[PDB]
CSV table of C-alpha atoms in Angstrom, one decimal:
chain,number,residue,atom,x,y,z
A,1,UNK,CA,-70.3,-83.2,-54.3
A,2,UNK,CA,-70.4,-83.0,-58.1
A,3,UNK,CA,-73.8,-84.6,-57.8
A,4,UNK,CA,-74.6,-82.8,-54.5
A,5,UNK,CA,-75.3,-79.5,-56.3
A,6,UNK,CA,-78.0,-81.4,-58.3
A,7,UNK,CA,-79.5,-82.7,-55.0
A,8,UNK,CA,-79.6,-79.1,-53.7
A,9,UNK,CA,-81.1,-77.9,-56.9
A,10,UNK,CA,-83.8,-80.6,-56.9
A,11,UNK,CA,-84.5,-79.6,-53.2
A,12,UNK,CA,-85.0,-76.0,-54.3
A,13,UNK,CA,-87.0,-77.2,-57.3
A,14,UNK,CA,-89.0,-79.6,-55.3
A,15,UNK,CA,-89.8,-77.0,-52.6
A,16,UNK,CA,-90.9,-74.5,-55.2
A,17,UNK,CA,-93.2,-77.0,-56.9
A,18,UNK,CA,-94.4,-78.3,-53.6
A,19,UNK,CA,-96.4,-75.2,-52.5
A,20,UNK,CA,-96.7,-73.0,-55.7
A,21,UNK,CA,-100.1,-74.2,-57.0
A,22,UNK,CA,-101.7,-74.6,-53.6
A,23,UNK,CA,-104.1,-71.8,-54.2
A,24,UNK,CA,-105.0,-73.1,-57.7
A,25,UNK,CA,-105.8,-76.6,-56.4
A,26,UNK,CA,-107.7,-75.0,-53.6
A,27,UNK,CA,-110.2,-73.4,-56.0
A,28,UNK,CA,-110.8,-76.5,-58.1
A,29,UNK,CA,-111.7,-78.7,-55.1
A,30,UNK,CA,-113.9,-76.0,-53.5
A,31,UNK,CA,-115.9,-75.8,-56.8
A,32,UNK,CA,-116.5,-79.6,-57.0
A,33,UNK,CA,-117.0,-80.5,-53.2
A,34,UNK,CA,-116.3,-84.3,-53.2
A,35,UNK,CA,-116.6,-87.2,-50.8
A,36,UNK,CA,-115.1,-90.7,-50.2
A,37,UNK,CA,-117.8,-92.2,-52.4
A,38,UNK,CA,-117.8,-89.7,-55.2
A,39,UNK,CA,-114.0,-88.9,-55.2
A,40,UNK,CA,-113.1,-91.8,-57.4
A,41,UNK,CA,-115.6,-91.0,-60.1
A,42,UNK,CA,-114.4,-87.4,-60.2
A,43,UNK,CA,-110.7,-88.0,-60.8
A,44,UNK,CA,-111.2,-90.7,-63.4
A,45,UNK,CA,-113.6,-88.4,-65.3
A,46,UNK,CA,-111.2,-85.4,-65.2
A,47,UNK,CA,-108.1,-87.5,-66.1
A,48,UNK,CA,-109.8,-88.7,-69.3
A,49,UNK,CA,-110.7,-85.2,-70.4
A,50,UNK,CA,-107.3,-83.7,-69.4
A,51,UNK,CA,-105.4,-86.3,-71.5
A,52,UNK,CA,-108.0,-86.4,-74.3
A,53,UNK,CA,-106.5,-83.1,-75.4
A,54,UNK,CA,-102.8,-84.1,-74.9
A,55,UNK,CA,-100.3,-85.9,-72.6
A,56,UNK,CA,-96.9,-84.8,-71.4
A,57,UNK,CA,-94.9,-84.8,-68.2
A,58,UNK,CA,-96.5,-81.7,-66.6
A,59,UNK,CA,-100.1,-82.7,-67.4
A,60,UNK,CA,-99.3,-85.9,-65.6
A,61,UNK,CA,-97.7,-84.2,-62.5
A,62,UNK,CA,-100.6,-81.7,-62.5
A,63,UNK,CA,-103.0,-84.6,-62.4
A,64,UNK,CA,-101.2,-86.4,-59.6
A,65,UNK,CA,-100.8,-83.2,-57.7
A,66,UNK,CA,-104.6,-82.7,-58.0
A,67,UNK,CA,-105.3,-86.2,-56.8
A,68,UNK,CA,-103.0,-85.7,-53.8
A,69,UNK,CA,-104.9,-82.5,-52.9
A,70,UNK,CA,-108.2,-84.2,-53.7
A,71,UNK,CA,-107.3,-87.1,-51.4
A,72,UNK,CA,-106.2,-84.8,-48.6
A,73,UNK,CA,-109.4,-82.8,-49.0
A,74,UNK,CA,-111.7,-85.9,-48.9
A,75,UNK,CA,-110.0,-87.7,-46.0
A,76,UNK,CA,-109.5,-84.7,-43.8
A,77,UNK,CA,-113.2,-84.2,-44.5
A,78,UNK,CA,-114.2,-87.4,-42.9
A,79,UNK,CA,-111.8,-87.5,-40.0
A,80,UNK,CA,-113.3,-84.4,-38.5
A,81,UNK,CA,-116.7,-85.7,-39.5
A,82,UNK,CA,-116.2,-88.9,-37.5
A,83,UNK,CA,-115.2,-86.8,-34.5
A,84,UNK,CA,-118.6,-85.1,-34.9
A,85,UNK,CA,-120.1,-88.6,-35.4
A,86,UNK,CA,-118.7,-90.3,-32.2
A,87,UNK,CA,-119.1,-87.3,-29.9
A,88,UNK,CA,-122.6,-86.9,-31.1
A,89,UNK,CA,-123.4,-90.6,-30.4
A,90,UNK,CA,-122.0,-90.5,-26.8
A,91,UNK,CA,-123.9,-87.3,-26.0
A,92,UNK,CA,-127.2,-88.7,-27.5
A,93,UNK,CA,-126.7,-92.1,-25.9
A,94,UNK,CA,-125.8,-90.5,-22.5
A,95,UNK,CA,-128.8,-88.1,-22.5
A,96,UNK,CA,-131.2,-91.0,-23.1
A,97,UNK,CA,-129.3,-92.9,-20.4
A,98,UNK,CA,-130.0,-90.2,-17.8
A,99,UNK,CA,-133.7,-90.1,-18.9
A,100,UNK,CA,-134.1,-93.9,-18.8
A,101,UNK,CA,-132.6,-94.0,-15.3
A,102,UNK,CA,-135.0,-91.5,-13.8
A,103,UNK,CA,-138.2,-92.8,-15.6
A,104,UNK,CA,-137.5,-96.4,-14.2
A,105,UNK,CA,-137.7,-95.0,-10.6
B,1,UNK,CA,-121.6,-82.4,-62.9
B,2,UNK,CA,-119.5,-82.3,-66.1
B,3,UNK,CA,-119.6,-78.5,-66.0
B,4,UNK,CA,-116.8,-78.2,-63.4
B,5,UNK,CA,-115.0,-81.2,-64.9
B,6,UNK,CA,-114.5,-79.6,-68.3
B,7,UNK,CA,-113.0,-76.5,-66.7
B,8,UNK,CA,-110.7,-78.3,-64.3
B,9,UNK,CA,-109.3,-80.4,-67.2
B,10,UNK,CA,-108.8,-77.1,-69.0
B,11,UNK,CA,-107.1,-75.7,-65.9
B,12,UNK,CA,-105.0,-78.8,-65.4
B,13,UNK,CA,-103.8,-78.5,-69.0
B,14,UNK,CA,-102.5,-75.0,-68.4
B,15,UNK,CA,-101.1,-75.9,-65.0
B,16,UNK,CA,-99.5,-79.0,-66.5
B,17,UNK,CA,-98.0,-77.1,-69.4
B,18,UNK,CA,-96.6,-74.5,-67.1
B,19,UNK,CA,-94.7,-76.9,-64.9
B,20,UNK,CA,-93.3,-78.5,-68.1
B,21,UNK,CA,-91.6,-75.3,-69.2
B,22,UNK,CA,-91.0,-73.4,-65.9
B,23,UNK,CA,-88.5,-76.0,-64.6
B,24,UNK,CA,-87.4,-77.1,-68.1
B,25,UNK,CA,-84.4,-74.8,-68.3
B,26,UNK,CA,-83.4,-75.8,-64.8
B,27,UNK,CA,-83.1,-79.5,-65.6
B,28,UNK,CA,-81.1,-79.1,-68.9
B,29,UNK,CA,-78.5,-77.2,-66.9
B,30,UNK,CA,-78.1,-80.0,-64.3
B,31,UNK,CA,-77.7,-82.6,-67.1
B,32,UNK,CA,-75.1,-80.4,-68.8
B,33,UNK,CA,-73.1,-80.4,-65.5
B,34,UNK,CA,-73.3,-84.2,-64.9
B,35,UNK,CA,-72.8,-85.4,-68.5
B,36,UNK,CA,-74.2,-88.9,-67.7
B,37,UNK,CA,-73.9,-92.0,-69.8
B,38,UNK,CA,-75.6,-95.4,-70.3
B,39,UNK,CA,-73.5,-97.2,-67.5
B,40,UNK,CA,-73.2,-94.3,-65.0
B,41,UNK,CA,-76.9,-93.2,-65.6
B,42,UNK,CA,-78.9,-95.2,-62.9
B,43,UNK,CA,-76.0,-94.8,-60.5
B,44,UNK,CA,-76.3,-91.0,-60.7
B,45,UNK,CA,-80.0,-91.0,-60.2
B,46,UNK,CA,-79.9,-93.5,-57.3
B,47,UNK,CA,-77.1,-91.5,-55.5
B,48,UNK,CA,-78.8,-88.1,-56.1
B,49,UNK,CA,-82.2,-89.5,-54.9
B,50,UNK,CA,-80.6,-90.6,-51.7
B,51,UNK,CA,-79.0,-87.2,-51.1
B,52,UNK,CA,-82.1,-85.3,-52.1
B,53,UNK,CA,-84.3,-87.3,-49.7
B,54,UNK,CA,-81.6,-87.4,-47.0
B,55,UNK,CA,-82.4,-83.8,-46.3
B,56,UNK,CA,-86.2,-84.1,-46.6
B,57,UNK,CA,-89.1,-85.6,-48.5
B,58,UNK,CA,-92.4,-84.1,-49.7
B,59,UNK,CA,-94.6,-84.1,-52.8
B,60,UNK,CA,-92.6,-81.5,-54.6
B,61,UNK,CA,-89.2,-83.2,-54.0
B,62,UNK,CA,-90.7,-86.4,-55.3
B,63,UNK,CA,-92.1,-85.1,-58.6
B,64,UNK,CA,-88.9,-83.1,-59.0
B,65,UNK,CA,-86.9,-86.3,-58.8
B,66,UNK,CA,-89.2,-88.2,-61.2
B,67,UNK,CA,-89.1,-85.2,-63.5
B,68,UNK,CA,-85.4,-85.3,-63.4
B,69,UNK,CA,-85.2,-89.0,-63.9
B,70,UNK,CA,-87.5,-88.8,-67.0
B,71,UNK,CA,-85.4,-86.0,-68.4
B,72,UNK,CA,-82.3,-88.0,-67.5
B,73,UNK,CA,-83.7,-91.1,-69.3
B,74,UNK,CA,-84.4,-89.1,-72.4
B,75,UNK,CA,-81.0,-87.4,-72.4
B,76,UNK,CA,-79.1,-90.8,-72.3
B,77,UNK,CA,-81.7,-92.1,-74.9
B,78,UNK,CA,-81.4,-89.3,-77.4
B,79,UNK,CA,-77.6,-89.4,-77.2
B,80,UNK,CA,-77.1,-93.1,-77.5
B,81,UNK,CA,-79.6,-93.4,-80.4
B,82,UNK,CA,-77.9,-90.8,-82.6
B,83,UNK,CA,-74.6,-92.3,-81.5
B,84,UNK,CA,-75.6,-95.8,-82.8
B,85,UNK,CA,-77.1,-94.2,-85.9
B,86,UNK,CA,-73.8,-92.4,-86.3
B,87,UNK,CA,-71.9,-95.7,-86.1
B,88,UNK,CA,-74.2,-97.5,-88.5
B,89,UNK,CA,-73.7,-94.8,-91.1
B,90,UNK,CA,-69.9,-95.0,-90.6
B,91,UNK,CA,-69.9,-98.7,-91.2
B,92,UNK,CA,-71.9,-98.6,-94.5
B,93,UNK,CA,-69.8,-95.7,-95.7
B,94,UNK,CA,-66.6,-97.6,-94.8
B,95,UNK,CA,-68.0,-100.7,-96.5
B,96,UNK,CA,-68.9,-98.9,-99.7
B,97,UNK,CA,-65.6,-97.0,-99.9
B,98,UNK,CA,-63.8,-100.3,-99.3
B,99,UNK,CA,-66.0,-101.9,-102.0
B,100,UNK,CA,-65.3,-99.3,-104.6
B,101,UNK,CA,-61.5,-99.4,-104.0
B,102,UNK,CA,-61.6,-103.2,-104.2
B,103,UNK,CA,-63.4,-102.8,-107.5
B,104,UNK,CA,-61.0,-100.2,-108.9
B,105,UNK,CA,-58.1,-102.5,-107.9
B,106,UNK,CA,-59.8,-105.3,-109.8
B,107,UNK,CA,-60.2,-103.0,-112.8
B,108,UNK,CA,-56.4,-102.4,-112.8
B,109,UNK,CA,-55.6,-106.1,-112.5
B,110,UNK,CA,-55.3,-107.0,-108.8
B,111,UNK,CA,-53.6,-105.5,-105.8
B,112,UNK,CA,-50.0,-106.6,-106.7
B,113,UNK,CA,-50.3,-104.9,-110.0
B,114,UNK,CA,-52.1,-101.7,-108.9
B,115,UNK,CA,-49.9,-101.1,-105.7
B,116,UNK,CA,-46.6,-102.4,-107.3
B,117,UNK,CA,-46.9,-99.9,-110.3
């Protein structure tokens, strides 16, 4: 349609902005190393400094893009950690279960 | 510590200023080809947003829509403001030109006398 070309352009635009700065968010997160606790403190402290020097559309989208990469990094970080936390518990609890079973006899 | 946090805010400023200007030429062309207006504005954005997300949704497609909607809002804004400013100045100019003629007519002795002669 007359507006359909805009929808196709926004798709191309959106797909180019989607995965362009992936490498440059990668480096900022790997040089902070955050966690579910200290993720909130980090973003609020950066957003103040980023906007203390100026505010516009891109500085806002760059900040929200960082927070989305930060959120993905922090919560993927704990999902695999809880896998390592549950499987560790069953293995440790089991191992002590087999020992407690043979000592009582 | 605040060491990394000064640099990431300095990096986000460059990153943020790059996405302002990189796609900036690309939006102004789409607004040139819609030519939207106060009444048909929201309808355009709502119907484009549906079509844009009918084919897929992700982070980039969302910020691209909001970036377009903010530029769309400014474009209708900037145009309507100067349009109203242009109409205000036309009214005062018409009033003052009307007022000076009504004065000149009175200086010649009324409308029947000025126009009749």
